[PDB]
Amino acid sequence: MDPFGKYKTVVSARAADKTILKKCQDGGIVSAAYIYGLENGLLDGVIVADKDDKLQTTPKVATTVDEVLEAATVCPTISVIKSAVREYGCEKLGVVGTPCQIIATRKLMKYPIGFRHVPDKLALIVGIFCMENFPYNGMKTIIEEHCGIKMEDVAKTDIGKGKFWVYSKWGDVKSIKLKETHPYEQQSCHVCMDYTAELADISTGSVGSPDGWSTVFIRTAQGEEFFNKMVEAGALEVKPIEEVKPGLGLVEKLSLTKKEKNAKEIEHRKEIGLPVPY
Amino acid sequence: MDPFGKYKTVVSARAADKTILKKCQDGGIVSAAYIYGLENGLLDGVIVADKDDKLQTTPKVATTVDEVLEAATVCPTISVIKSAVREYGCEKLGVVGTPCQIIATRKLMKYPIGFRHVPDKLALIVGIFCMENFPYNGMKTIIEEHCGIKMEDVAKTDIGKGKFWVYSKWGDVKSIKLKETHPYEQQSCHVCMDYTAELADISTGSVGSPDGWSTVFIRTAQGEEFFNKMVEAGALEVKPIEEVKPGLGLVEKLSLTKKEKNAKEIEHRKEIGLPVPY
Amino acid sequence: GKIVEIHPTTRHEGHTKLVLKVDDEGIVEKGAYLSVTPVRGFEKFLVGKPAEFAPIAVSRFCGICPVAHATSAVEAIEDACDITPPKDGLLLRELCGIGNKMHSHPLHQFLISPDYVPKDDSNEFIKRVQAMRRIGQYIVDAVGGEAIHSPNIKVGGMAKQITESTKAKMYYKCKEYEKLAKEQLEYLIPIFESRTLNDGTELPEKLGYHDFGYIATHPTYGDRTKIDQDKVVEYTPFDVYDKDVAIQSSTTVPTYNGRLMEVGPRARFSKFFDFKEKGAMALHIARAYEISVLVKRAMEILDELNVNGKTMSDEPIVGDGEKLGLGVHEAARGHNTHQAVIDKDGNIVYYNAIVATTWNIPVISKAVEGTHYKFAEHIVRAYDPCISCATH
Amino acid sequence: GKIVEIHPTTRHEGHTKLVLKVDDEGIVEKGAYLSVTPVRGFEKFLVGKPAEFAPIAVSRFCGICPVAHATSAVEAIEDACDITPPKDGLLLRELCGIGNKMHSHPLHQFLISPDYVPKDDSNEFIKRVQAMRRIGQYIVDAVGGEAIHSPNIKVGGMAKQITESTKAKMYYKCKEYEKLAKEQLEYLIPIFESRTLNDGTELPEKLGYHDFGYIATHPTYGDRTKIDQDKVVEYTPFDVYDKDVAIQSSTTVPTYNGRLMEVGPRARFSKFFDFKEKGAMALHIARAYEISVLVKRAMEILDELNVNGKTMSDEPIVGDGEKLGLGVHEAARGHNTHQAVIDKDGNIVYYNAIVATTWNIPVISKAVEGTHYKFAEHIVRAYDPCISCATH
Amino acid sequence: VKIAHIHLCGCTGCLISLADTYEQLLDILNSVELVYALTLVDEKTEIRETDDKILIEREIPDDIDIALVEGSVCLEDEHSMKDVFDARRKSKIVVALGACAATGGITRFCRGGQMSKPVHSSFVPIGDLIKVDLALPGCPPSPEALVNLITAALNGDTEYLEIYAELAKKTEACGCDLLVNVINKSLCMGCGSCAASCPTRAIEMIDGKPNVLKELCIKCGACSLQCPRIRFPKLIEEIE
Amino acid sequence: VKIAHIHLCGCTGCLISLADTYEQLLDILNSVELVYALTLVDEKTEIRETDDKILIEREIPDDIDIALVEGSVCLEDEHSMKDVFDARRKSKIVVALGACAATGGITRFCRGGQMSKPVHSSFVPIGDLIKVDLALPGCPPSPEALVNLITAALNGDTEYLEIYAELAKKTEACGCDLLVNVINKSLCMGCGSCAASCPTRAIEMIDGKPNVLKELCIKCGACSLQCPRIRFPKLIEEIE
Ligand SMILES: Cc1cc2nc3c(=O)[nH]c(=O)nc-3n(C[C@H](O)[C@H](O)[C@H](O)COP(=O)(O)OP(=O)(O)OC[C@H]3O[C@@H](n4cnc5c(N)ncnc54)[C@H](O)[C@@H]3O)c2cc1C
Ligand SMILES: Cc1cc2nc3c(=O)[nH]c(=O)nc-3n(C[C@H](O)[C@H](O)[C@H](O)COP(=O)(O)OP(=O)(O)OC[C@H]3O[C@@H](n4cnc5c(N)ncnc54)[C@H](O)[C@@H]3O)c2cc1C
Ligand code: NFU
Ligand code: NFU
Ligand code: SF4
Ligand code: SF4
Ligand code: SF4
Ligand code: SF4
Ligand code: SF4
Ligand code: SF4
Ligand code: SF4
Ligand code: SF4
Ligand SMILES: [Fe+3]
Ligand SMILES: [Fe+3]
Ligand SMILES: [Fe+3]
Ligand SMILES: [Fe+3]
């Protein structure tokens, strides 16, 4: 059972821009990459999640650094990919998504029936690690009725150390056991066989790296060229993942735990005759 | 090859009401039956074709004698059968239709999925003989560009003696060969295996009987009871079909010609894999 | 003490469970009645659909009381869009709702007949119920187009005029229904007043007592000006059940000014007919009396109706995407609320439903306390619960 | 004498046949050009559909000029409903139509290149056409959403604003297109003026001459006030063809004041640029010059466009079921007319389309007379026929 | 013959349609033995008393002859899934009663997110999970259709039931079925009976042809069941 | 490899999409031999001269390797019927090019009555009459998809083509395909790629789920072709 898919290198990294690091709980790789690209003409638009005051999200085509800094539950990022290259005119588009969204992106590039003049405009495809997603009202139950915190009082949410975390605007930090959140997961997530966004140009997540840092997989030539430009310009700080704690072993465990679990669900669905991707 | 389906008796008949006979070119059986029923409480509503000044037709639920006398190309009669028993409140509904429409009526009575409290409200089901139908604009081409007569100048149209006939409001009568009209027929008519409306309570047409008279098949107990009431009341004049010219032999020929021809089309469709009713 | 769980409960619509804590004598100390029906999620899937689809979809909350949801939906959307249904459309719409209730209340009496009607009377009793239901459903078929999910209930009024003949047929049938209702009432009232089951079990005097107020806006239709919707707040199961039970509940918890409220026939009778009796048997009694109120109003409507009156407003289905339209209707089981925000293209921006049994479920949880657990299902059934309604 | 039948004709869109009566020397005495394409029947199946579906459906008349039909459709429906598109929406809509024509005219030049372009020049010629088409389709993709069937063309205006960056990219491309167009014009004009085919065949002087007038309402967009639609009457094939040929024809026969009329680039050039040359070669010449007119107007629009201007009217799609809305547009191949009656619910009561090539087909029938039958297809192609358009 | 009503994610309207046999319902209920129906009878009650709990459960009885199954299956609800499989296990004949059970119907539009079970989002017709022997479309099917189906099942009228046995193999329905299988195939003769069959009035006859108002279609299948140019078995030709 | 474009009841937009390879079209046309395409070449011309008539006909040539067939078949038009069968007879590989040919597309809504051929009312995808080897959905499919399909056919990349070989067996498509096969089956993860694929903008993502505006759907099949929870062959996992 392959744990990470194919990649060229894997490092721990974080944005060198301290203002970016403040707006992100992890290494801020997506924002750093977007901003570096926009500011140097390597990207002319980037897809971000524009949430409202209720944690309700909406994908948006950002074209300025300020918009990226404002955008630092399902958000259908791929739904704006055509708008991005039509009325927004983007020719070097940055895309961000969970593994399933990166899967959708590779599918549309390979079989582009409804994607006239889209595939060649995708200049950087960034995947973020993902274990599961929740319907909004499922997450709302977790935070409000199991953690006892109002959604509008939320400034940071996180998963780690076997717990779900809510960081209140007013300073409080509350956490519960991960087993209490399982009943609220999107059950479509239970056939997902991709933890580290294996098909991205660059994949990034918090797990494997210390606080304020991200584990980054560089996978494709497009990803490697971009990442090397940011490193050479000083836009990222990079350390070997072998030097950081907890390290790549934690990423492997979580990825293999996901694939083992969801492989069981895929077989079960096949046994009772429900469809699965093939 | 059975020619007429099942029936109890077959006669030549015409309305005794001379005003009805004036409004109909044939024996006026449908109007006579509708009017007799309404006037005696055997029917409380009847479905008629309400055409506009352009020969464009619309089915309508009639509840008065006058409406029937006003209504004396496809007209979807069965489309108002539910309205008839809901907001019109009919409990003894008269239905008229071509053979395919009578087929649809027997189907809905036997498998009444979408016909809650409809079947038992059908008190008389009258079928009219039919060889083929035309799209309106196909018939328009026949009359205007092959017969040279404006549609708005049409007061009577008829088929017989191997010809299509247009009777002008201004007195003229024009006719052409039936072979010239064949290209304009509704090709859905070419799988139709029913000439005399074999599934009706009472079936009636002009063929087989002299001018001003109709061939009438009495088929069901419901049809026989109704017809006998009209005869006993004097609402119809009746003669044996064996006594009239051209007689039942012409009906047989035309019916068998239709079934032979359309049987060939059904087999052809099956050979090339197009669907047919079964 | 012991836990008593009854699952599923029976002879009401839909899927619920009772979870009771009882003492050694079996007296209920803490009650929980809850829907465990799956959430089909009508409020969420209506977002993005055209306004006209709302009455079609929400009718499918429930096949017993579908008129109630179609009516609340179209009233909510009309309020959102400032559409006024014409007067004869409103008469037809109320008549449709009354026809639905004229079938529902006898149906409920049929559902409870194994508890209250002697076996030797059952056949005659059921024949009478079914004779009454035939007339109720006839009204809904004629005016609404279909008795079970009425397509004629539309934003703007009612889609179809009836003929003068259909009006007279409905009138004849209403007169026959009134005679049947008299017989049904004189038969059942003595039974409900006897406080005895048909097997001889004596009912406790305080059966089903509770301390909550009532909501009803009208005796036969609905009136949005009689409720302050800003004071209606929906809480979660975790606010009224223990955690192990709250995670099972499928419904929201409606409150008015922070308190639970009962809805239904006894609510209406307390607000409009000076009927203040408490307890569960008083619910059956008010429902039985309400049958007469309903058919009397139907005949009053028939007298007033102009069958050539306009039935649909020509006003366009155009909202401003901001106003929260309010549609209320007195369903057979009580005050029924739909809400909608409509945009300039007539599409649904937001949708919400607070249904009669949604209100009564947490009331029932309390009502079953204080008496033996063997009476808990009898208290449940006094409320004529519609769980698919409550859950939508 | 002899009958000459050519079927199908080639290097235009769609399926047509030529039926010619010629003398012993081959000179055409009586001409018939006719569509034999099946009638998909858009005008009939639009009845009963929502107004918004019209531009989506009629775009599928034709994948070469789909913008023309979406534009005429939305203009007809806006006229029916008294909707005024906002000024920047109208600019974007005209820009979309110009982008479509900026691809179509070079495409036509490609289709005729086997007749007029030497083989040794063909590769370079086609590369230039395709460079120009790339820019035309880029404009339609950006403004219309898709180059082939543009969903942004809607009743009320245009669905999407473009950004200032996209406007500048279009401007850059228009400047490159203008340079390519200059090269294309200086290359082709001498050929069209030479009256010689690339195989040396001399063209007769009176090739394609006819005696009919012209309809054009605008040089680049359309203007319904420039045509009296009451004087446009559609006759049948039996009015212009012999019976054996008339029964094969799929199209109607449009007339103005009882007469046939030519539409297209030469019509526009005669009405607006003082270009009065007759015959078939003058059609090619006017089309070639029109490419420059188009890109100049596109750049003028880009200068005037406010990318933050409102693009869709908030006016509701409500008709009175009576007014016959009129939508006209100068398609690449000519004056294009859609008509619609819209009811109060925004649904289509009646729909009609009279398309550019519908007008030109009976003109071509006459134009091919008087010269050898070997030139008849060259006269056909001068008109850039779109048969799927003509038939719909 | 032992019959049961199994209610999954339905609205109970299909059972009410059965109840709209009115007085005749008593005749129907005397020609069969109704052994299970949560809405109507207190079966099958099983009590499990321990020291701390009394559990009073109503279970589906074994040995059902005919199961009338109404509603669709919620894939994310364990009880919904258990009940559909239990109904199949315990019954010799399974009827998909109504559109929800037969083809999904209105529940095709469910997509989750609503309190108090926001995870409930995937609803399927029962035949996506179990073998279905007969399927009745409509929303709801009429009382008359139900009477006919029960009568035929009791009398062994396999010929009458064939059309519904065939329907049980198809778990999707849509107004565009009329287009795909009739209009587009040169079979529609314009009778208009489909329009009269539709419970939402989604079909309008225009110029002799059906026009489907797709945003009003609830995928009930009544129209294609009706169309006589799809199914017209010879038994319909036997008239009084 | 000899290729032909056969145009039935289409709009020529699928051919224009091929033309929107722009300069690359010349490369494409040099990797194959275009032997028939009424819009582009004067083939295959056959002259039959008698005493009274000269008949100059353009026929489909025999021995085509790949036929790109665009448009649906009009059942009431004899030439339309003849051409679809002739294309199949003369070609080794038939591609249903675009929605009209593959699943009917916009022509599903045809219902006749229009001058000057009011009898023309029944339109079907080509696979309702002939064997189809590959089907490309969309209205039109993109130039990129067409380049990929031609390249794969020339290189014998059967694995790449499998998804389109499978599509050739299904002659119906609809936005409700996303509901029936993904949302209702607990598979939709809300990526929104279906919405971005749709040519008419009929799909709107709401709360993470696709909402289909059915009256805007033209039955092109682009959305279900895209959805990665339906088809996701392993070859897509091979990245640069
Ligand atoms: C549901 C979910 C589960 C996750 N689980 C894990 C996990 O188990 N382990 C782990 O190491 N990381 C996980 N992540 C990723 C983690 O939360 C960070 O997003 C990741 O470290 C990259 O953040 P960054 O600091 O590098 O980027 P930043 O600079 O913070 O930018 C983050 C980017 O993510 C985008 N984004 C936000 N929400 C979404 C969304 N719903 N869909 C798509 N894009 C979105 C924003 O638009 C933004 O551009 C998960 C993310 C999600 C949404
Ligand atoms: C397309 C067509 C073909 C026919 N072909 C033949 C034929 O080949 N031989 C033959 O003997 N008779 C044929 N008839 C029947 C014939 O024209 C007369 O209708 C028949 O003699 C009965 O008329 P009547 O005088 O008895 O009834 P009347 O008293 O004249 O009443 C006639 C009734 O027919 C109804 N009607 C009219 N048009 C339609 C329609 N399109 N669909 C359904 N109902 C309609 C009217 O509502 C009216 O109630 C055909 C009819 C049609 C519509
Ligand atoms: N009565 C009733 Fe319903 Ni089935 C409930 N509860 C609706 O509003
Ligand atoms: N140009 C053009 Fe079309 Ni294909 C034609 N003729 C449309 O209006
Ligand atoms: S677990 Fe898989 S399907 Fe679910 S959100 Fe994450 S990447 Fe998507
Ligand atoms: S020929 Fe048959 S299908 Fe055609 S109209 Fe007459 S009865 Fe109907
Ligand atoms: S088919 Fe219709 S009536 Fe029957 S359960 Fe489903 S929604 Fe209710
Ligand atoms: S029932 Fe069938 S044949 Fe009759 S109109 Fe409807 S689709 Fe056409
Ligand atoms: S069109 Fe009407 S009858 Fe046909 S499936 Fe849809 S809702 Fe049911
Ligand atoms: S699929 Fe679309 S673009 Fe291709 S022929 Fe059909 S309508 Fe034209
Ligand atoms: S592409 Fe498939 S998984 Fe993604 S949102 Fe659409 S239906 Fe759901
Ligand atoms: S929803 Fe859009 S992409 Fe899907 S079939 Fe319909 S038109 Fe095509
Ligand atoms: Fe970290
Ligand atoms: Fe006669
Ligand atoms: Fe609710
Ligand atoms: Fe036209």
Residue numbers in the entry:
A (entry chain B), B (entry chain B): 1 to 72, 77 to 282
C (entry chain A), D (entry chain A): 2 to 393
E (entry chain C), F (entry chain C): 2 to 241
Which sentences did the original study use to describe this structure?
FRHs catalyze the reversible H2 oxidation coupled to the reduction of coenzyme F420 (8‐hydroxy‐5‐deazaflavin, ΔG°′ = −10 kJ mol−1). The overall reaction requires three components: the large subunit (FRHA) that harbors the [NiFe] center and oxidizes H2, and the small subunit (FRHG), which contains three [4Fe–4S] clusters to transfer electrons to the flavin adenine dinucleotide (FAD) located in the F420‐reducing module (FRHB, harboring an additional [4Fe–4S] cluster). FRHABG dimerizes and forms dodecameric assemblies of about 16 nm in diameter with a spherical shape and a hollow core. Here, by characterizing the native hydrogenase from the marine methanogen Methanothermococcus thermolithotrophicus (belonging to the Methanococcales order), we provided an unprecedented functional understanding of this enzyme via a synergistic approach of biochemistry, X‐ray crystallography, and spectroscopy.
Further depiction of the active site was done on the MtFRHdimer2 form, as it exhibits the highest resolution of 1.65 Å. The deeply buried active site of MtFRHdimer2 is similar to the structure described by Ilina et al., with a distorted seesaw geometry of the [NiFe] center and an apparent vacant site between the two metals. The ligand‐to‐metal distances are in the range of the MbFRH structure, albeit with some shifts, particularly between the Cys66‐Ni and Cys387‐Ni. However, the trans S–Ni–S angles (105° and 176°) and a short Ni–Fe distance of 2.65 Å, which are crucial for efficient hydrogen activation, are almost identical to those in MbFRH (108°, 170°, and 2.70 Å intermetallic distance). Notably, we did not observe a partially occupied ordered water molecule in between the metals as modeled in the high‐resolution structure (1.45 Å) of the Nia‐S state of Hyd‐1 from E. coli by Carr et al. This discrepancy might originate from the slightly better resolution or the presence of additional redox states with a bridging ligand in the Hyd‐1 structure, as indicated by an additional CN− signal and overlapping CO bands in the corresponding infrared (IR) spectrum. Moreover, IR and RR spectroscopy confirmed the presence of the Nia‐S state, previously observed in MbFRH. This state was postulated to be mandatory for the thermodynamically favorable binding of H2 and corroborated the vacant position observed in the crystal structure. Nevertheless, the comparison of Fe‐containing MtFRHdimer2 and Fe‐depleted MtFRHcube does not reveal any structural rearrangement of the surrounding residues or the ones in the vicinity of the [NiFe] site. Therefore, the importance of the additional Fe site in modulating the redox properties of the [NiFe] center remains to be experimentally investigated.
